[PDB]
mmCIF file of C-alpha atoms in Angstrom:
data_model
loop_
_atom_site.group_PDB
_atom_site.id
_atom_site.type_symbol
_atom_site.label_atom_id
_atom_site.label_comp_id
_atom_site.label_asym_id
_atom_site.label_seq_id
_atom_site.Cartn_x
_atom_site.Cartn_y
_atom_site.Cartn_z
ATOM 1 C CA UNK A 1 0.000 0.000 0.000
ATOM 2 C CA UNK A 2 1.404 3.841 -1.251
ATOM 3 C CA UNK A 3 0.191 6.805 -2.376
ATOM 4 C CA UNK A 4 0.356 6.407 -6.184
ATOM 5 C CA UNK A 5 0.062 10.211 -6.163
ATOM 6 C CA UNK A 6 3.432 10.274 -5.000
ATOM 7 C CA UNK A 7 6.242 11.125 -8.466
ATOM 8 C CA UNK A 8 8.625 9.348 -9.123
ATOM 9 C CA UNK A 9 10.385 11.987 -6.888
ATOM 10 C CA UNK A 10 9.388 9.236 -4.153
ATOM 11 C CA UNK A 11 12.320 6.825 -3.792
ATOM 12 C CA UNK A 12 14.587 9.451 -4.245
ATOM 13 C CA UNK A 13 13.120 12.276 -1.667
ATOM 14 C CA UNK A 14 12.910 9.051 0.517
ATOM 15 C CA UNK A 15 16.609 7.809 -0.535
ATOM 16 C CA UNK A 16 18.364 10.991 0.594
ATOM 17 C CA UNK A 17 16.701 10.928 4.043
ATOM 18 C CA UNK A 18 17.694 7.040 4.329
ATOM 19 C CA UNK A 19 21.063 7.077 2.649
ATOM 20 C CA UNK A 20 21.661 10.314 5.021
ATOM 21 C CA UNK A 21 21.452 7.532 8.213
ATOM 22 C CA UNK A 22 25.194 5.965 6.361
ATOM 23 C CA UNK A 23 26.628 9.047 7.576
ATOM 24 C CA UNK A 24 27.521 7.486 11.040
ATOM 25 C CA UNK A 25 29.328 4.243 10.180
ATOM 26 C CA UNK A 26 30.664 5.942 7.207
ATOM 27 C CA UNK A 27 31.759 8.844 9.715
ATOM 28 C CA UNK A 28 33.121 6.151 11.620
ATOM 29 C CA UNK A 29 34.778 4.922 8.794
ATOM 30 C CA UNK A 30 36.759 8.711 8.542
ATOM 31 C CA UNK A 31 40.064 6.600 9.607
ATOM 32 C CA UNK A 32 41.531 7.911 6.196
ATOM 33 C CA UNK A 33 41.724 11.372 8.248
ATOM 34 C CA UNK A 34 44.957 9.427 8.390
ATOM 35 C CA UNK A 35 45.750 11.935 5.409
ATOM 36 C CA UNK A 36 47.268 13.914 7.733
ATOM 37 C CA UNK A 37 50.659 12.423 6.741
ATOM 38 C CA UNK A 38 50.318 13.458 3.699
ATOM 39 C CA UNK A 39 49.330 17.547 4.242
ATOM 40 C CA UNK A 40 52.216 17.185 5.913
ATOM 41 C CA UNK A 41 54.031 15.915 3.255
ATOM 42 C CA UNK A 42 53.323 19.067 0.833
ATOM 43 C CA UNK A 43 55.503 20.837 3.559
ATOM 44 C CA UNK A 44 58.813 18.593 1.564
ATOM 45 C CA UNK A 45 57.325 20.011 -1.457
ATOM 46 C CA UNK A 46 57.462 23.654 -0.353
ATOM 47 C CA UNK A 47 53.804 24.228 0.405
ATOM 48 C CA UNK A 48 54.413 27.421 0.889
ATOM 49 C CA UNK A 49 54.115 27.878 -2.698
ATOM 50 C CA UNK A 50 50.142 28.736 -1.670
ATOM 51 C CA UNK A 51 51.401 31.544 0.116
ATOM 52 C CA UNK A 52 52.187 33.992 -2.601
ATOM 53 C CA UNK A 53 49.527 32.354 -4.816
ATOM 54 C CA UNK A 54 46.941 32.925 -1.758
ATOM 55 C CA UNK A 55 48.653 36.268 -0.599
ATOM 56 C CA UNK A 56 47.749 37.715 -3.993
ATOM 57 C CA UNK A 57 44.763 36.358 -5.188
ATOM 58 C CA UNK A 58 42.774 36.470 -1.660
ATOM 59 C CA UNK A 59 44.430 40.107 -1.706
ATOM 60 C CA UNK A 60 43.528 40.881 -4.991
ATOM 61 C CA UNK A 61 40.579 39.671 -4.555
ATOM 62 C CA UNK A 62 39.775 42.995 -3.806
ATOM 63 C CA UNK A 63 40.745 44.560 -7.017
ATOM 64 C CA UNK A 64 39.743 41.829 -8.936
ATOM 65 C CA UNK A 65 36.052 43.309 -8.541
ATOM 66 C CA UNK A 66 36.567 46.469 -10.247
ATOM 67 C CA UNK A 67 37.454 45.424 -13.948
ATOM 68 C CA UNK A 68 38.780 47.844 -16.510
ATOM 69 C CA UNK A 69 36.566 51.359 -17.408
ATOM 70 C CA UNK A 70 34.468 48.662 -19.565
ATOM 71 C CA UNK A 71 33.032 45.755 -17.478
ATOM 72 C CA UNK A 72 31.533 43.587 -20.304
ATOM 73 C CA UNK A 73 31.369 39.748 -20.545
ATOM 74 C CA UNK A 74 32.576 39.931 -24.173
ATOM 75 C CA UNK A 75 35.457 42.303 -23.867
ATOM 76 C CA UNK A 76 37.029 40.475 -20.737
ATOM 77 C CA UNK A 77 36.894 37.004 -21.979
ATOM 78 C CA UNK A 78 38.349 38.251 -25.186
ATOM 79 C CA UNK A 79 40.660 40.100 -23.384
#
């Protein structure tokens, strides 16, 4: 017995609610936070590389919103 009014949106709405209850023993299953290791292996690599890259962009970031006297979609892209 089910409401045949229900769409097909049914087993999915439904799905998303269930498949939300794998969360815990999936959480549980985080041990590949392990990765840790690993962020700390892109210090070998000089990680730090991120800084300049981050130290402009975030900080231009803020002039990166005002775009030449002409702000057009076709203009930028093409230049």
């Amino acid at each position: 017995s089910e409401a045949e009014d229900a769409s097909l949106l049914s087993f999915m709405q439904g799905y998303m609610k269930h498949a939300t209850k794998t969360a815990k023993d999936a959480l549980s299953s985080v041990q590949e936070s392990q990765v840790a290791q690993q962020a700390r292996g892109w210090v070998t690599d000089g990680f730090s590389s991120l800084k300049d890259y981050w130290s402009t962009v975030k900080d231009k970031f803020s002039e990166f919103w005002d775009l030449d006297p002409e702000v057009r979609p076709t203009s930028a892209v093409a230049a």
